[PDB]
């Protein structure tokens, strides 16, 4: 038979989901970032935990270790590229200082909100899911899309979108047709 | 069999070269070199700038805003001149616009003699549209500032537009308006015009951040191009449809492949901090203010930091730069910087050389497929530059100090045999910059057409 295709879980349930302080924390995160459910928060937390555990393991290694240098440098480059880690903080210690909010801001939903294309984070979500937002020349419909520094300046209304210069959507032309008739 | 016909045309063409005289072989490559989009007119070294016969001809109209020159050309494909009629055989014409809403044509056939006026047409308040609607802005004459002029390569029409959001095409012989094409935009003011070489296609750059393509023979609009984030101030065209434009403060030069409907991005991205470090005054570019195509695969631009940049289609960044080409402006006068009686107090306000700023490249024109181009400012002299053989750098060939004022637009015209060619440079001179009147009145600046005939010897 054909060789297996690997798969993995992108989120993990917390050690104690029932902490009241925690519950308030996810309430904050969902409310401010307009997240649909808790699974999104758990996913981001799992990714962050993997990153910081790798950083800790790298720190345990002695300085100038070739593995340390190579892998730490790669991790810092990736974190800088996605934009969570600022340029002036290129050391493994500050990686351990990252927070869930940093990743959350880089989500295409939040970036769309900040750029002024949407009046609410929920408005940003509905705009994205309705194929109105394009990074560069390509249309992205996924709120969880993570924006890179270079990609940030290229977010715009899609060419095919009615807001982006295309013809009016179905409702608009339907109303115009009935009005003319 | 049409191949026999080509052979006959080639045979007659070959006989011409024998009259023109290795030499035959080289000249054969040169004539078709227009087809291959590469520079093939290497005459910079043999040029004689110092002996140029300079002349300044005064003109009544104020702020001459642009000039367009028409030159008949022998076409190798059919071996016939481009003159519109038998009367116009080898007659050179120049058209000019001003902020006085007046069109004027001049005969520039006689290099030794100054431009001679033939006919003119003037606009005014009579031509204001009553309707107030964009699509009814179809009056015969102009009513607002005329900014640009272009002559059709066929010698049959001359087309002008300006801040009236209108483009009027006129008959060359009588300067009679034959068609009016509104831009149909609230802010669609025409800023530059360029005729495709040896074609009737016209490219118009408008203030509404768009480029509009027209067909003069059909008197109709064709397409609109989008992609600039700021006004499209200048446009240049060659035989091929790869017209180039500069978007002013968007600081991006753009090449448009019309049939491919794609557009190549070009940005300077130079920073003083690295320039000073590599040196271990430099003014950071704010806006690109002129563009002209030296080649199908190369073009040059001027900025508002006095930087002349050479470009190639392959590379996104500039390949060679000439910073502060026209020099730095005079320092502000100490008697006027401050009202302090004490002179030393006034000198402190000059703040050393920090307040000093560079000249702007108001004009920049390159002879097609050649190794020489001309730049202009209100420094009071026209500078002639020569590009290297490898097309990787250029050097200052010389200067012409006759011009005094803002050089709104530079044109070059050639005459004589292929071996012996005399180049006559015509530059419109004004007292204020074409797009507006920011510039402080330059001492001595006059409204006129500057002329300089240069002989070619070696």
């Amino acid at each position: 038979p054909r060789a297996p295709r690997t798969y993995s879980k992108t989120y993990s349930t917390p050690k104690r989901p029932y902490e009241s302080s925690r519950l308030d924390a996810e309430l904050k995160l969902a409310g401010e970032f307009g997240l649909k459910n808790k699974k999104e928060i758990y996913r981001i937390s799992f990714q962050l935990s993997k990153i910081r555990r790798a950083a800790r393991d790298l720190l345990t290694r002695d300085e100038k270790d070739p593995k340390r240098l190579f892998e730490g440098n790669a991790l810092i480059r990736r974190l800088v590229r996605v934009g969570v880690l600022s340029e002036d903080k290129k050391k493994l210690d500050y990686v351990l200082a990252l927070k869930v909010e940093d990743f959350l801001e880089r989500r295409l939903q939040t970036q769309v909100y900040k750029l002024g294309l949407a009046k609410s984070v929920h408005h940003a979500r509905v705009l994205i899911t309705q194929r109105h937002i394009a990074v560069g020349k390509q249309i992205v419909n996924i709120p969880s899309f993570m924006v890179r520094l270079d990609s940030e300046k290229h977010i715009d209304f899609a060419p095919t979108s009615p807001f982006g210069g295309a013809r009016p959507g179905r409702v608009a032309r339907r109303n115009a047709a009935r009005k003319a008739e | 069999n049409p191949a026999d016909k080509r052979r006959r045309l080639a045979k007659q063409y070959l006989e011409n070269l024998k009259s023109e005289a290795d030499i035959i072989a080289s000249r054969l490559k040169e004539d078709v070199a227009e087809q291959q989009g590469r520079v093939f007119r290497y005459f910079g070294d043999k040029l004689l700038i110092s002996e140029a016969k300079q002349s300044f001809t005064r003109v009544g109209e104020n702020n001459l805003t642009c000039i367009s020159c028409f030159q008949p050309v022998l076409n190798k494909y059919t071996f016939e001149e481009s003159s519109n009629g038998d009367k116009n055989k080898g007659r050179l014409f120049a058209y000019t616009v001003s902020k006085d809403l007046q069109l004027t044509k001049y005969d520039i056939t006689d290099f030794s003699k100054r431009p001679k006026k033939l006919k003119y047409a003037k606009g005014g308040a009579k031509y204001i549209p009553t309707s107030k609607h964009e699509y009814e802005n179809t009056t015969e004459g102009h009513y607002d500032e005329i900014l640009t002029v272009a002559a059709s390569p066929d010698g049959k029409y001359v087309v002008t537009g300006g801040r009236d959001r209108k483009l009027i095409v006129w008959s060359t012989e009588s300067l009679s308006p034959v068609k009016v094409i509104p831009t149909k935009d609230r802010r669609g003011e025409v800023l530059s015009l360029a005729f495709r070489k040896n074609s009737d296609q016209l490219y118009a750059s408008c203030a509404d951040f768009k480029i509009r393509t027209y067909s003069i023979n059909q008197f109709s609009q064709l397409e609109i191009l989008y992609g600039h984030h700021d006004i499209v101030e200048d446009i240049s065209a060659l035989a091929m449809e790869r017209c180039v434009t500069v978007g002013a403060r968007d600081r991006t030069a753009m090449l448009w492949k019309i049939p491919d409907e794609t557009r190549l991005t070009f940005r300077g991205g130079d920073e003083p901090q690295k320039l000073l470090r590599r040196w271990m005054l430099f003014f950071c570019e704010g806006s690109i203010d002129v563009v002209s195509m030296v080649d199908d695969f190369h073009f040059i631009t001027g900025s508002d930091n006095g930087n002349i940049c050479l470009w190639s289609l392959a590379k996104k960044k500039p390949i060679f730069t000439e910073r502060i080409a026209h020099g730095i402006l005079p320092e502000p006068s100490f008697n006027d910087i401050s009202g302090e009686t004490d002179e030393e107090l006034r000198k402190r306000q000059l703040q050393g050389k920090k307040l000093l700023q560079p000249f702007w490249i108001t004009s920049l024109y390159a002879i097609p497929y050649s190794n020489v181009f001309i730049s202009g400012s209100w420094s009071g002299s026209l500078k002639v530059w020569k590009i290297s053989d490898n097309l990787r750098s250029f050097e200052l060939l010389g200067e012409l100090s006759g011009a005094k004022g803002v050089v709104t637009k530079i044109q070059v015209v050639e005459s004589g045999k292929h071996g012996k060619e005399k180049f006559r440079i015509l530059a419109s001179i004004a007292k204020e910059h074409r797009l507006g009147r920011w510039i402080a009145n330059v001492s001595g600046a006059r409204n006129g057409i500057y002329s300089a005939v240069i002989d070619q010897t070696g």
């Binding site: 900040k114 | 920073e271 704010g286 910087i337 009202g339 402190r348 307040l355 700023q357 507006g436 920011w438």
Partner: protein, 121 residues
């Protein structure tokens, strides 16, 4: 020490003039010394721009007196002809003002430039 102070450098002036042109397109720019004075009186000015080559310089020194009284950042550019150019007006401008608007489409770069101007001060 010089009356025009602080004076932006070649790099810094470009971003400032960049915001100026964007503000002019969006009707968020007030052009001329007289207008800038009015904005400072109303407390609707985000920050004020002046040209260091004003001839004479004194006729705009009243804005600095107003500015830090109202705790408004300000900065000088070397050129007025350049400042007028970016303003979109066919004449030189010695001073201009960026009107406050937290709903503006160009908010982010306005605060970015403002942060640098505060650092320069």
């Amino acid at each position: 020490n010089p009356k025009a102070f602080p004076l932006a450098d070649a790099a810094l002036t470009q971003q400032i003039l960049d915001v100026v042109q964007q503000a002019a397109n969006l009707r968020q720019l007030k052009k001329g010394a007289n207008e800038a004075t009015k904005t400072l009186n109303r407390g609707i000015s985000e920050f004020i721009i002046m040209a260091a080559d004003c001839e004479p310089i004194e006729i705009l020194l009243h804005l600095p007196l107003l500015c830090e009284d109202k705790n408004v950042p300000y900065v000088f550019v070397p050129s007025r002809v350049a400042l007028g150019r970016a303003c979109g007006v066919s004449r030189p401008v010695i001073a201009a003002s960026i009107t406050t608007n937290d709903a503006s489409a160009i908010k982010t770069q306005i605060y970015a430039v403002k942060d640098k101007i505060e650092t320069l001060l």
